[PDB]
Amino acid sequence: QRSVARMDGDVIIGALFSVHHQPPAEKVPERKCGEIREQYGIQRVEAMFHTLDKINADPVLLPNITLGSEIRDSCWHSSVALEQSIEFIRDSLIGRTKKPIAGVIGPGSSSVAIQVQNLLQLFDIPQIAYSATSIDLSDKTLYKYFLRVVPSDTLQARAMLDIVKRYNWTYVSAVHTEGNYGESGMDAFKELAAQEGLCIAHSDKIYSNAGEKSFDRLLRKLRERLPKARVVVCFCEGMTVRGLLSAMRRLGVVGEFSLIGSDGWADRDEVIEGYEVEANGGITIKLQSPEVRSFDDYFLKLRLDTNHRNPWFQEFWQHRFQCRLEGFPQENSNFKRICTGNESLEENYVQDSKMGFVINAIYAMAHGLQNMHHALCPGHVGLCDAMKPIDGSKLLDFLIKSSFIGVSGEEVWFDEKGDAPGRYDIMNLQYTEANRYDYVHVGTWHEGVLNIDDYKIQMNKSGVVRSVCSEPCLKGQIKVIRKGEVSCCWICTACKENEYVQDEFTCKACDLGWWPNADLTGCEPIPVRYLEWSNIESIIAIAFSCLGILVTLFVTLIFVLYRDTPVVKSSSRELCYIILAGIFLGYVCPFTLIAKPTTTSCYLQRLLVGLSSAMCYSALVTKTNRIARILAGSKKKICTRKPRFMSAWAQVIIASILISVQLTLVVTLIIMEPPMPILSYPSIKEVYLICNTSNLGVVAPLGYNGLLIMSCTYYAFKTRNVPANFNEAKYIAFTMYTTCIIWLAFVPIYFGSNYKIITTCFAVSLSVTVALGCMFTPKMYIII
Amino acid sequence: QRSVARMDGDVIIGALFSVHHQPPAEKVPERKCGEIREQYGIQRVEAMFHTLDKINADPVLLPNITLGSEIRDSCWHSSVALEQSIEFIRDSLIGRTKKPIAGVIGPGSSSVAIQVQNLLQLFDIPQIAYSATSIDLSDKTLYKYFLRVVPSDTLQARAMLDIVKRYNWTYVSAVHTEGNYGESGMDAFKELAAQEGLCIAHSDKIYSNAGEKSFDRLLRKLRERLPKARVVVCFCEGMTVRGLLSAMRRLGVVGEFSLIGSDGWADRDEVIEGYEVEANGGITIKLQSPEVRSFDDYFLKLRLDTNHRNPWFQEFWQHRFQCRLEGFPQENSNFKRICTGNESLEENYVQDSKMGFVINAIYAMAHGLQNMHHALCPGHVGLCDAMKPIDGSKLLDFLIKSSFIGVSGEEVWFDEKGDAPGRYDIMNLQYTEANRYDYVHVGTWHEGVLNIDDYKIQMNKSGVVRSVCSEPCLKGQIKVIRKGEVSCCWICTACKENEYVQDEFTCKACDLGWWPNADLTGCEPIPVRYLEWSNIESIIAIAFSCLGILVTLFVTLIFVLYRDTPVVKSSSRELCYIILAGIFLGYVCPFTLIAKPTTTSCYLQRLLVGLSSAMCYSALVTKTNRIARILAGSKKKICTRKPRFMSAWAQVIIASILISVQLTLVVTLIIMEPPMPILSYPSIKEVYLICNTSNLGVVAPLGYNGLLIMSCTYYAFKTRNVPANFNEAKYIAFTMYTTCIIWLAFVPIYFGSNYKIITTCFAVSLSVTVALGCMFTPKMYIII
Amino acid sequence: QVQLVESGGGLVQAGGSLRLSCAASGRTFTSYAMGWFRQAPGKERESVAAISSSGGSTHYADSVKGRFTISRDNSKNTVYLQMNSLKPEDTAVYYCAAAMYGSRWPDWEYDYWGQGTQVTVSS
Amino acid sequence: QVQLVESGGGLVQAGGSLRLSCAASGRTFTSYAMGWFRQAPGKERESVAAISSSGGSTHYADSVKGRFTISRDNSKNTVYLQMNSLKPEDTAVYYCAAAMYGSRWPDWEYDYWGQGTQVTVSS
Lengths: 784, 784, 123, 123
Ligand SMILES: N[C@@H](Cn1oc(=O)[nH]c1=O)C(=O)O
Fold this sequence. Notes:
The complex is a heterotetramer, with two copies of chain A and two copies of chain C. By secondary structure, chain A is an alpha/beta fold. Chain A is built from 20 helices and 20 strands. Chain A has helices at residues 42-57, 78-93, 110-120, 153-166, 180-195, 212-223, 238-251, 293-300, 313-320, 355-373, 392-401, 536-561, 573-593, 599-609, 611-631, 648-672, 696-719, 728-750, 757-775, 777-782, and strands spanning 5-7, 12-17, 69-73, 101-105, 127-129, 146-148, 171-177, 199-206, 283-287, 404-405, 411-412, 424-431, 437-446, 449-452, 479-480, 492-493, 499-503, 506-509, 514-516, 523-525. In chain A, the strands form eight sheets. A four-stranded mixed beta sheet of chain A has the order 1-3-2-4, sandwiched between helices. In chain A, helix 12 packs antiparallel against helix 13 (573-593). The longest helix of chain A has 26 residues, at 536-561. The radius of gyration of chain A is 53 Å and the shape is rod-shaped. The N and C termini of chain A lie far apart (145 Å). Chain C is mainly β. Chain C has strands at 4-7, 18-24, 33-39, 46-51, 58-60, 68-73, 78-83, 93-99, 112-113. Chain C is globular. Chains in contact: A-B, A-D, B-C. The interface between A and B is medium-sized, with 23 and 24 residues. Ligand QUS is lined by residues 108-110, 131-134, 181, 237-238, 263-264, 354 of chain A. Residues 108-110, 131-134, 181, 237-238, 263-264, 354 of chain A line the site of ligand QUS. Chains A, B: Homodimer; disulfide-linked. The PPXXF motif binds HOMER1, HOMER2 and HOMER3. Interacts with TAMALIN. Interacts with RYR1, RYR2, ITPR1, SHANK1 and SHANK3. Interacts with SIAH1. Chains A, B: One of its GO terms (molecular function) is G protein-coupled neurotransmitter receptor activity involved in regulation of postsynaptic cytosolic calcium ion concentration. Chains A, B: L-glutamate binds at residues 40, 110, 131-133, 181, 263, 354.
C-alpha cells in the first residue's frame, strides 16, 4: 500500500516522482521500495506543489481554473510505477466518488516512462517526461502521448562522441545501464564511435539496482585492459555509476581509469556522495537548466508543521537528519537521537539539475490546458462544457503546438515528435579547495558547438592519457598486424628491414639490385663498386707492377737493342724475345686488370685472371721446354725419343704450340662462359655489383699452367745440379722454386680471397718480377 | 473496443491469442488490427473452446466445476495486448463483478508476453505462454507469474552445442539476428560454448532489415575466415538467413560452409523459397511438437451455422473463402461473391506446430485449478469458500508444482524458473529426390538427450564437413605454439632436438646427460665414446704400433745380445746406453696411447697425452744431442766454447739432465692442472672422449721439440754434406729432416681440425718408428 | 453487456417520413448487427428492418422495401432508420434487437434487446 | 479517504480485560497512524491512546498509562485496544480516529473519525 499526495482542483494533474529508491534486487517481485531519495523525488513533490500553488495563484494562467495534483511514487521500477499508473486510470477505469487525471508528469527513468506510456496512451492521458532521454521515445507511433521538455539521447551520444574524439581517445571501455536509457542511448553512441574512428574495450551492460557481486564482476571485466584503454565511457544512470564507485572502493580501483559520464550522472552530488576520491576528474554532461530560485526559497522554508499535503515528508525528514520523532506520527523505530526542531535543510544541499525541467513540465500541462480553454470554449471563463471532461488527444494537440518560456527564463516548445530543445553543459568533478568537491561548468555542447578549455579541466593538460590499444607506434619502417578481430586495436611491429613498406598493411621485400632506401619508401641502387680506377691498398701493387713495366723497358734496352751478348749471339733469339713478350704481358696485366663492373671489362678481368695467367706460363713453359728441347739429345736428361728438332725456329714452334693449346682452350671456355658483374649477396650491405665466376672455370687455366709447373720443376730436377752457365744452376733452381711455391701458395689463398683478382695481380707480380730480377739481373749484368 | 469470445463457466481462464495481424504503421497509435491470421488466431480460439469442452466433460479434471473463458485478441502487438489485459482486470478490479480471471493463456509473441506479464503480475494472475520462448522470461524477479510449456532459447543454445559437439566441430563462427530473441539466445549459447570447449571467429550482429551490402560484408568477413572455418552457427531468423543466403548467391558460394541455425528457419521454407539449392547441408533445429488430432476433427466439423460462441469465425470464413455471406450478420461487403452452401475447411489445412503447446497450456491451467482444489478445498467437491474468489498467488504455487501428461502423451513440466523441458526436432535440408529439397528430420533432441540418427544426415556431405582452428598434433616432438589470441586458434610446431614435451604446450629441454627418448616423452642416459681399439681404421694405427714393437723387440734381442759391435761402441759406451733408453722410452707409451680416461686412470691417461709425446721427443733429442755434442766436442764443430770434461761420464751426465729437463717441463705442465676430462658435447648428438687441452700445453712441448731438433741439425749442417763412417750421421741428419717435417706438418691437422686423439698417436708413433727406422735399423745390418 | 434505448417513434401521418434512433450502451456495439422487429397490438412480431455490423449491405422487408432507409454509426454507438410513405398500419412496437451471430436474414438469434416503441401512428 | 468502523463493545464489570478492534476500509493504510478517544457521560472526548503509522511506537494517556495495550495489523487494516484491570471510570463512548500529518502526540490531525461505541465498566 502506497501514499498519494493529492491536492484538490477542477483539473487534476497526476505525476510519477521517484520518491523512494529502486527496490532491492531480490525484493522487486514484492515491490517494496527502500529509502527516500532526498534530492530526486521529494524535492520534486515540493516542486510540483509549489508550482501548482503558483499557477492556482497566477492571474493569467488558468484564471478561475483551479489545479489539483495527485503525485504518486514511481520508485524507479517498472512494476512499482505501473501499479500507480493503474491507480491513476483506476478512478475512471472502473452517484459520484472520484475525479479523472487529465495529465501525467511522466517519470525520470526512460524505462518506467516507457511502461507508464504503454499503459497511459490506451486511456488518452498525456505524459510529459521532465528528463527521460532514451531515443526509443522519439517514435510517436508506439509512444504517441510522449512529450519531453529535454533533449533525446542522440544529442548526448553525439556530445560524448565529440568529447572522446576531441581528446584523441579511440579505444575506450563502455559500461552502461540495462534498460532503455542505457540501451538506446549507448547503441546510438557506439554506432557513431564505429564510424568516427573509435574502438571498444568491453561493451558491458549492468542493471541499476544490481547487487554488489555483479558490480565487482563488471570491475573485473573493466579493469582487464586497463593497462591500455583507460577511458570508460559510462552511459549509466546515477545509481549504476554509484555501484561502480562502490566496487572502486571495495577493491582499490580508486585512481585507475577515468569516468566520462552522461545525463544520468549529470550533476548529482548523491552519486559521488561518499565516493569522491574514487572518481575525480569525471567528465559528465548535464542538460542546460538554470536552478529555480523561488523553489530554493519555498523549500528551505519548509517546517515539519506546514506540510499537511506531502505524505513522504515525515519519513523524508527522519531520513534527512538520521533522527527519530519522539511523538510525531509515522515515526521509524530504526532511527535514533530524537530530532531537535532547529534543523535546517541547507546541509550539503544541492537542489537538483532536473528541477528547472520538472517545473517546465508542470507548466507545459498548465499551458496546454489554458490553450485548450481559449481554443474550445473561448469567451467563457474557468471551466466550460468542452474539456469537461478533458480529451487527452485534444490536449496533446495543444501541448505539441504550444510554446512558452518556463520559470527559469528558457524557451521550450515541442517538435512534431514531442521533443524539446536543449544545450548540454559539460561538467568536470574536481578538488576545488583544500579537499572539497564540485561539478563546474568546464564547457558547453550546443548543436555541433563544443567549448572546453583543457587547462581548467581536471587542472591538468597532460591529464588523461592518449587512450588507444596500439600507439601511433607506426613510426617509419613499421606495419600493422591487424590483430585478427579488431583492426582499430591492431598489433604494432617493425617489419623485416630488407622489406620496404609502401602500403600501411603490406611491408614488402624490394627487388634485387635495389636496396631499400630511407624510411623504406622505395629502394635505391646498390651502387657500382668500381675496380677500374685504383685503390691505395692495391696502388702498392699497381705501382710495383709499373716498376715491373719499367724494368721490362730495361730488359728491352739490354736485350732488344744490343744483341751483342754471348747469351743472344748464341741462344735462339726468339725464346728470349717471347719470355720478354710474356713478362710484359704479366706487367701490362695490372693495367688491363683493374676493370669497370660492366660485362666488357668483366671479360677483360677474365682475360687477366685465366688468360694472362696462361701467358705468364707462356713465358715459363717456353723456359722449360726450351732448355728441355736442348736437354732431349743431352746427357743432363736420359731419353731416347727426343722431343727436339734441328731447326731453332722449330724449337720455338714446339714451345709456342704448347702455350697455344692452353690459350685456345681458355679462349674457347671464356667465349662459352657468359661473364657478368653481379648483384649477389655475400652480405646485404656491400655495394658489390662486381663480377661472378665458378672457380673451377679458372682452375683449368691454373691446371694447365700447373701441370706444366710439374713439367718445369721436373726439368729443374737435374738442372739445379748441372752448374754450367754462370751460376744459373743456383738461380734457375731457386727461381723455379719461387714460381712453383708462390703459385702453390696463392691457390688456397685465391679461393681464400672472396674476390680473387687482388690475389692474382699480387702472385703474378711476384712470379714475373722474380723472372726479371733473377733470370735477367745475373746474365745481362755480367755482359753489361 | 474489440470482440471477446466467452464461455460462462465457474472459474474463468482468460486468453490472449494473436487473432489478427499487428496494426501496420498507418494505425499503430489508433491500434486497429489487420486481417485474421487463420493459423495463429482463430485456429487457436477454437482449440481453446474445444479443450474447455473436453475439460468440462472430463470427470477427473474439475468434477462439478464449469471452466469458462474470456478470449481476447492480442493482434501480435504490445499496445493491443495491453488494452486487452486491462479489459480482463477491469471487471475484476470493482450489472456488477462477473468473475476474476484465474489465469491468462499468454499471447504468442515473447515481447507482448513480457509487456502483458507486467500488467498481470500486478494483480496476481498467472500467465502461461505457449510461445514466449525468450531467455529473459525465466527471470521470475520481474516476470514472476510467467509459466510456459515451451523451453527458453537457452535450450536451443544447449541443443546447438549438442550438435556442433556431437560432430567434434569446435571452430564455428557465430552469426545472429539482433534483438531479445537473437542476441539473448546467441549470447547464452556463446558463453555455454566457451565453457564447453568450443570456439568462434566472428560474432555477426546482422539485422533483419539490413541492406544486401550488409549481409555481403558480414559474409565477406566470414569468407576471409573461410580457409580455416567451415561451420557457421546462427541464431538468425527467416528473412535474416534469407538475406545471408542472398549474399551467398551474389558471391557464387552456394554449398560451402555448413550453416547451422536455430528454429528461426527450421520449418521456414520461405527462407529457401525459390532458393533451396543454395542451402544444402544446413543443420537446423525446432521444437518437437506432435500434431493434435481430436482438434483437427473438431475444427473440420465447425459448422458456421451451428457456432454461437465465437465472433471471428465469420471473418475466418469470409477471409479464407473470400465470400460475403449476404444473409449472415457482419457481412464483409468488401469481398466480391456470395457464399455457396458447400465450402469446408478440409482444403489447404495446416494444423500449426504451436497448437500442441496451446492445448498443453490450457491443461496446465486446468490442472493448476484442480491441484489447488485437491489441496485447498479438501472433503468438498468443486468451489468451496476458500478459492472463492480464487486466489492467484496460491494458484501459482500449485500450478508450478503440478506435473501432468499433455494431449500428445508428453508431460508438461515446470522448473523453479517456470519454464518447460524442451523437446526438439533436429532437421536437415538435402537431396531428397531428383534434385528436390524438403525439410526432413534426422531425429530429435529431448531433455538433455540427443538423437542424431546420422545415416539420414546429408549422405556423408555433413558426414565429411569438418572445421577446427588447429588440427591436433598431440604427438610428442610437436608442440602447440600459439599467439595470445584464443584457445582454439593455435599453431602446431616441431620441437628442437634437446627438448621434449613434458609440458605438452612447451617441449622441456632436459639437462645435458639425459638426451630425449624417442617420440620426445622423456630423456634417458647418453652413450659414450672411449676408444680402446677405436676402429678397424684405428686398428691400422694399432697395426703400425704393434709391428714397430715387434721389430724393436727384435733389435733388443740381436743388438744387445751381440754386446760387441765396433761402430756402436766407437765412442763412450754410456752415450750408446742413453740412446737405447731414449728410443724405447719414445716407444713404450705409443704402444699404449690407447687408454681409458677415469679419475683413477687420469694420471695414466693425461700422462700419456703429453708424456708419450714428451718421451717420443726425448728419444729424438738424445740422438740429436749425441750428434751435436760429438760435433761440438770433436774438431768437427770448431769453437772457442767447446765445454768438454776429463772423464766422458760427465759428457753423458749432461745428456741425462738434458733429457730430465724436458721430463720436468712436461710433468710440471701436467701438475699445474691435475688429471681429468672435460666432456664438451659440441651437440646433443656428438658424444666423444675429449680431454682438456689448454692449447698452451700443445704449442709449448711442440716448440721445445722443434727448437732442440733445429739447434742440433744446425750443428749437423756438416753431416748432411759428408759422413766419415758407414753413412750414420748423414742418415741421421736425414732422420732429423724426415721426422721434424712430419711433426711440424702435423700441427695444423691437430690444431685447426676437429679430431685429436688418434692424430697425436699418428704424430708421435710415426716420429719414433721412423727415427728408429732411419738411425737404428741400418746399424744392426752394417755391424754384422 | 449491451443496454439499449429506442427513440424517434411518435405520432406522424400517412406519408410522414419519421426517424428511428436506437441508441446503445456497450462498447462492442460495432460487432453487433441491428434489426427492428415490428409488432403492433393485435398483430404478432415480424422482422421488418435490419442492418449488418459493418453497415455494409443491409435489409428491409420487401413489403416496405423502398419505403424506408437504414443507417448506422459505429462512432456514436447508435443505429438509425427512417420510415417513408408511412401508413396507419406501418406502426408497430419497434423492438430494436441486436444479434451478433445468426443465419441468413431474418433468422439471426437476436441476443440483446431494446425497449422498442409502439410508434403511435395516425394519418 | 479511508473510512473506519469499530467492533467489540461490551458491558463488563471491573477487572474484566476487554477487547476493542477498529477496522479500516480501503487501500493506503500502512501510511496512517491511529488513535483511540473516549468521552464519559457528560465529559470531553479524551485521547485514550494511539499508535504510529508503521507500528512499533505507541502512546497511552497518563490516565490509563501502560495498562491498556494498542497494536495494529496493516494486512487487516485494523487496530486493537486490549484494556486490562477495567474500572467503572473506564466507561465512556470509545471512538477510533486515523491521524496523519500530526505534531508531537497528542497534537495530531485526527481527520478520519470512526463510528463510535459504548464500552462500559459496570459493577
Ligand atoms: N537520462 C536518464 C534520466 N536520468 O537518469 C537518472 O538516473 N537520472 C535522470 O534524470 C534517462 O533517460 O533515463
